[PDB]
Design a protein around this ligand. Structure first.
Ligand SMILES: O=C(O)[C@@H]1CSc2c(C3CC3)c(Cc3cccc4ccccc34)c(CN3CCOCC3)c(=O)n21
Ligand SMILES: O=C(O)[C@@H]1CSc2c(C3CC3)c(Cc3cccc4ccccc34)c(CN3CCOCC3)c(=O)n21
Lengths: 210, 210
């Protein structure tokens, strides 16, 4: 019944807080919306650096409320030259007229003000594919988390084709499995949940974006 | 330059052959289209049970040809009560005016006439999710290959959310990693490359489609 307004979020480090919209799609019954944060290791954290409030709230049939995320002063102890990962969790509680199942678990990227991004900015095009045996060794030089959900020999394939999603941490690299493609097409997930497609060009084993 | 007309194919076992369209998107240069089949272990097979012809063909600038797939009499030695997997491979060869890179590698499902499917038929809705520690143990009772590319607590999440794609063989089961969702939403790939979404409902640890 209770749902979120997005499948992922980014926290603007230059702000003290932000908000996420929730709703009770059930127009005949009241539900409870429980929310909480977890660190990158998916462990629950009650007092900072990122807070989610209110922990619990009631939403009458068809209600449309929201949950607020804010930071504590300790948020400054996190690196300011790279994104930090957190998880936002939402669980619903039906009428007591009636197991820890969730409504949705989305990633929450803390983006320090230092590396703030301008609207519609692309940085995922800085990924470097390195041909290897069995696939590629993708490199992420950017200070952000880059999630790759597609990789094919053509654009339509990087979208329709099946791929083992992988999330590269800031300034890191990982090796994925793939067939050797003449002109590799990468597909990633942006901040709003979009699936843009990048066209790459190789030169030996090192492939880069056009 | 050379491209395929699909990212996956199904071979109707009740037919002797079928065809796939290829094109040279390059309107200023001639390219060669090389095609071949591989078995489920991705090993090249030259003489059956599934043949791809012609192995090599030329396509002048902007040309639109195609590759034909047919079966040999030995195709009958494959089980007839479940799909068999093959791979179709296409490589392009530019003008000699200028490493085994491919244009695209798609899956090829051999579907025996015995289990032929009627247009727009859905069978993926017969999957059974079994809650386990860390995720679910998906069951595929159908005699077809089922590829799961999404799995979230909501429909929009089963689409926008990141998931480690998995392909369940006919009459088989596999264990995937996932968070415990109140009302699980599964997303799979159909024959035409679509990404339908199935709404599940649980009852303990066993979740089934509505
Ligand atoms: O009754 C229903 O159908 C629902 C489901 S069980 C339940 C409880 C609750 C399990 C019994 C409480 C009682 C309750 C729930 C969460 C936190 C609380 C903190 C302090 C006092 C009461 C709280 C309810 C009333 N809450 C709704 C949220 O705002 C406060 C009043 C409620 O509607 N319901
Ligand atoms: O010239 C170009 O730009 C291209 C790229 S290299 C090449 C070769 C080839 C490497 C030299 C051959 C010669 C060639 C290619 C494949 C199979 C063959 C089988 C028997 C004789 C010739 C064949 C060509 C001519 N083929 C095109 C396909 O239909 C037959 C004629 C060709 O156009 N090209």
């Amino acid at each position: 019944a209770v749902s979120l307004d997005r499948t992922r979020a980014v926290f603007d480090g230059s702000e003290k807080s932000m908000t996420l919209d929730i709703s009770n799609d059930n127009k005949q019954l009241p539900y409870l919306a429980q929310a909480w944060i977890e660190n990158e290791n998916q462990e629950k954290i009650i007092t900072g650096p990122v807070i989610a409030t209110p922990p619990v709230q009631r939403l009458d049939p068809g209600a449309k409320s929201m949950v607020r995320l804010s930071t504590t002063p300790d948020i400054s102890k996190l690196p300011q030259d790279r994104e930090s990962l957190f998880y936002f969790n939402l669980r619903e509680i039906p009428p007591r007229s009636e197991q820890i199942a969730l409504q949705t678990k989305i990633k929450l990227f803390y983006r320090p003000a230092a590396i703030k991004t301008r609207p519609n900015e692309v940085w995922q095009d800085q990924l470097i594919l390195n041909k290897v045996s069995g696939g590629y060794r993708i490199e992420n030089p950017t200070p952000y988390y880059v999630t790759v959900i597609g990789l094919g020999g053509s654009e339509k394939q990087a979208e329709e084709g099946e791929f083992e999603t992988v999330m590269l941490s800031p300034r890191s690299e990982q090796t994925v499995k793939s067939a050797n493609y003449n002109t590799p097409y990468l597909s990633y997930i942006n901040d709003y949940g979009g699936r843009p497609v990048l066209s790459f060009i190789c030169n030996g084993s090192r492939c880069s974006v056009k």
